Amino acid sequence: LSIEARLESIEEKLSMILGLLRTL
Amino acid sequence: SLSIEARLESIEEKLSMILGLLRTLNIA
Amino acid sequence: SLSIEARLESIEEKLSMILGLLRTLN
Amino acid sequence: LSIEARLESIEEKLSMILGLLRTLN
């Protein structure tokens, strides 16, 4: 995967993590 | 087709929010 | 020191560990 | 900051996040 695609995936995982933490 | 620097800026903002929220959750 | 790709690999593994802990919290 | 320095800082923040999650559990 390109660096750009990898960073996009990292951003998506961070969005998920943040969403889960906000429900606590 | 976002630039790498713009993607890093978004990642950095999300990390900052995650850290602030986790510290808040850890308050006794 | 680390190449950009090696740093990304480390970041990706830490994210997997974080997500794994979130599903098993409490 | 260079991209390499920004990624190093991101990695450090992720390590801190892991520590905070471990304490929370």
Residue numbers in the entry:
A (entry chain D): 170 to 193
B (entry chain C): 169 to 196
C (entry chain A): 169 to 194
D (entry chain B): 170 to 194
Question: How is this structure described in the published paper?
Answer:
The essential polymerase cofactor P from Pneumoviridae is a multifunctional hub which interacts with numerous components of the viral RNA-synthesis machinery. Pneumoviral P interacts with both L and the nucleocapsid, thereby tethering the polymerase to its template. In HMPV and RSV a central oligomerization domain facilitates the formation of P tetramers. In summary, we have shown that HMPV P is a highly dynamic protein that is composed of a stable helical tetramerization domain flanked by large N-terminal and C-terminal IDRs that sample a large volume in solution and display varying degrees of preformed structural elements.
